[PDB]
């Protein structure tokens, strides 16, 4: 039940939700409640991770993959991209999020804000970029990072 | 007292206010005051709610729906969407806020202040994101979220 | 006196100034020095005020409209819009700005920044929104926001 | 040595930098280098200044104009506009920049140290606005305000 | 030791990453893993650096050029631009980023943040500008600014 | 806040409730439920106030008139009468209620608990008589007296 | 968070596990492993709930239904039975566990710690009774009780 | 950064250095310079490792092979041979070097600190032997052993 | 900081001063004011510097050349001469001063006056020689010697 499991759980629910919204509406006669299920048969995902501190990141990525397969996901339908550092996560995510096949992208990384001097500037940028990216491209982007 | 009732009331008033300005002007030879009546007949709304603290959130949604119907709203013209967490609200509001039918949307959530660094960055982004979306689509968004 | 006195003065100098900037280009003998006059006739205005802390906002609006007429402003060319809460001022202001008639907007607002939690976030985004509109819409606005 | 002289020097050579940049591509057969010269003949500038604290601001504005003429600039090609406060520098700056003939802009101002609360909210916004305008207008603007 | 080396290495492989991600599609049963690579034949670069503290920056500029050529780069395909300030880099980088024959941009400078004036504000602003340009234009940008 | 606000709101709720019971039953095959909406259009009301302590009463009664118009009431359909003192409140209310036009009645007054021996008697008398008239006439009569 | 969620999830896993063992063996000619996925499609369930502590038991029962339907369960494949006493579950559970259609049973209840010696005997007997049913009848059961 | 990565880097560029050195003489009309590039494609290497202390040596050998593939080397052109002790590294190294196809050799090992007397006699000889072989064979060999 | 910059700036404008003073005459009623100017097109220069303490002087030589080219100078019209001592500059400057196609001369060197031998005497002598040459030949000479 590591934090990587949480990111996968959030990602799966949205891919179903947006499908329901884009689909045909209800028959009326009451409040149109829209909900996202946990099924994962026929959903494609993407993941981005940083090389830095590969001893503490390998566990996170591995735990995330177990969530999809257990909930009914084929291992063949996952794409993995690795980037040098945390600063480069947003730009990489954009290329993945713009593909037609992909339906969700997860973000995994570790932060050293406070662990090293002069890092709060970089720390705020990644959080701001990923959220702002989601609105323009119309697609859920789960967020996950650790503090060192 | 409960923020659910208070937030919905604000949404009702601004819906009428915008309809007045988009129409004809007021009487001349005087400073035309503008105010929003509290009636709610003929309008359409939407709601987005999170799931953290499942016990507490249920009360808030009940208050919001009660105020809308009590002031003359039709239950047939309310749509509800549920999301996993607080980070996820801004993207959900995007889909609803830009439909040609809806007139206003309400966001309900719970924020944690200072518990862990992870939640600290979440609070800043959700506040900024909701405001910018409203200014770009010309519809009102009500920020009815509790803290702690 | 009150901040409404100072706030009104700045707006008056601006509307005419922009008129000069779009004036005839028949010059160049020496360096130009553009400046704003203090005439008020033929200048439309808009004013927006909140509702919380009614005991204060009443004097600010009362103590601000006087300066407009004192320069020759006609009361028929002023429009006022009341709004429920401070956090939802900017959305209303944008609607009035897009009207081709009005040439200036001023806002009254009382904030308790740095008093209690859940209000610092509100106190932060209010200023940022108003500034953004001015550059986008190209019409001056005055930040007539006070605090306890 | 004052900010007025130093701030201007940035303006002269970027006007030369952009002119050469959009004139030709890579020469070929060797590394390409682009550089700006400190020559002012044939260039037209613009300057914006604040009304408040006219004592200090008087010296700074005088210094900036001295540099332009010294390096070979004609005084007939300089436009100066005054504003009553720092808050309105960004909106005014955009007006001059959109003019096709101007080739660069310079900003002068003075900031006070904590006379009243929430000054930073006003103080920080001017810096943020200037940077945003430069990128979208694609024309340099200098930053030469001085703290009190 | 040379941070130009560290910045240069990151830029080289990101160009390779984009070369493959947006390349021809592929079909297979196993998971697809996309990884960077240090190979710099057929890649076009561009560098921007400031004069500020010219004693130190001149050293770093040489280091970046050494990395490209040693790793298979071509001196004929490197373009260099020099500017007089740290505040004044983002505007320059914009023009280079839009060239259709440029694959990456490397930005290096010096910050003396601390008790010095004007530096607390601009230090934050320069970072945000670079990040936004990357997502807007979909092209990597590296941040190799060192501080005392 | 103003206790007249509360007393006013209760009047509308009761008026609609009796307006519905006279009609036909609701949908069968379930539990019949009757609730009062807050719409306040097309309803006639009456108000009674005591002249003693005109300072507090004036604000209190003004706090009640706004409610009917704000919730969609016609401003020219509420009657007002005043009486020398508290003792005269019941008889005045009795006169109004018998009319075939007024649908609800509101009472306003200010009292001090047991200031003098005779003040104790009136306190019991004023409440006792008011309730009895409501049952006899079959018409709601709100209670709005203030103690101390 | 609630025990109702945890109890339901265990039932989902066990049902899949038993369907695998009772089936044919797998290939590979190596070390062989079994595990239960979390797909609830096509499985039938049943629940038994007590009545003490009216406030809480309903909340726990609600969560259990959500888990089954979210993970692919059908609304009309669940059977519910309600009984008064915590001492009274085992007799009810047996009547349901022996139906051919049912494939799992979930028990929800509340126990009291140390209130009286009478309840001490109650608590011991209920736990061991349910265990014996599972082994005797060869069908999984879940133990979703709370105390204090 | 480890000796495995650092030791390899020496190997790649000398293979390039010798290839260019024996290709042409002095160009003439200017100073002649000979330099090696960090390109590995088209080159075949050899590696020798010690059996003892397999824990530490496992990481170093893994690091060296990572560098070759990263810079563009094919894994099919790498030969690894193990030996039981440091004393036999020189004799084994000569065997690989005399092979005509190999272009360079790399040595890895770990030395303990004074477990038994006269260790220096054995310890020093390996370093001396490696240097002697290089001169007479006329082929580079790297030195990458690490003390305990 | 670079004293070569400070020395260079003085030399540039003095050449302009002589260009106008001995130019064509003029007639007028007001006072005539002759002023220098920073404009270096069509001006021929010449630099002399010493090897003494070659670590530092090489830096200054570059600074002087940068000033001339940036201010509109031409590299084709700069002549450089190097000598081995501070005592030995004046003789070298004499030959350069007599060239009919030279407008100014810049002399830079290092003095280590103090407890060192021979330096109290020569330090005075070198200064006098330069001054006398200027008046004798009627051509400006600049003194940019720095000392520890």
Author numbering:
A (entry chain E), B (entry chain A), C (entry chain B), D (entry chain C), E (entry chain D), F (entry chain F), ...: 15 to 162
Authors' own words:
As such, we found that a circularly permuted variant of a cage-forming enzyme, Aquifex aeolicus lumazine synthase, cpAaLS, assembles into a variety of hollow spherical and cylindrical structures in response to changes in ionic strength. Cryogenic electron microscopy revealed that these structures are composed entirely of pentameric subunits, and the dramatic cage-to-tube transformation is attributed to the moderately hindered 3-fold symmetry interaction and the imparted torsion angle of the building blocks, where both mechanisms are mediated by an α-helix domain that is untethered from the native position by circular permutation. While the wild-type protein, AaLS-wt, self-assembles into a ∼ 16 nm dodecahedral structure composed of 60 identical monomers,35 the negatively supercharged variants AaLS-neg and AaLS-13 adopt expanded 360- and 720-mer assemblies, respectively, constructed entirely from pentameric capsomers. Moreover, a circularly permuted variant of AaLS, cpAaLS(119), forms not only ∼24 nm and ∼28 nm expanded spherical cages, but also straight ∼24 nm-wide tubes of variable length. We previously designed two circularly permuted variants of AaLS and confirmed that their morphologies depend on the positions of the newly generated N- and C-termini. The native terminal amino acids were connected via an octapeptide linker using genetic fusion and new sequence termini were introduced either between residues 84 and 85 or 119 and 120, yielding cpAaLS(84) or cpAaLS(119), respectively.
Further increasing NaCl concentration to 0.35 M yielded a mixture of the tubes and ∼28 nm spherical cages ∼44% and ∼46%, respectively. The 24 and 28 nm spherical cages are composed of 24- and 36-pentamers, respectively, and both have tetrahedral symmetry, resembling those formed by the previously engineered AaLS variants, NC-1 and AaLS-neg. In contrast, cpAaLS(119) assemblies are non-quasi-equivalent, where at least one interface of the pentameric subunits remains uncontacted. While the number of pentamer–pentamer contacts remains 0 or 1 without NaCl at pH 8.5, judged by the 2D-averaged cryo-EM images, the mean contact number per pentamer increases to 3, 3.7, and 4 in the tubular, 28 nm-, and 24 nm spherical cages, respectively. The bonding network observed at the 2-fold symmetry interface of AaLS-wt is approximately preserved for all the interacting pentamers in the cpAaLS(119) assemblies. In marked contrast, the (pseudo) 3-fold symmetrical interaction interface of cpAaLS(119) assemblies lacks cryoEM density corresponding to the N-terminal α-helix(120–131). This finding suggests that the α-helix is unable to form the native-like hydrophobic cluster, likely due to the disconnection of residues 119 and 120 for circular permutation. The α-helix(120–131) domain is structurally disordered and unseen in cryo-EM analysis of the cpAaLS(119) spherical cages.
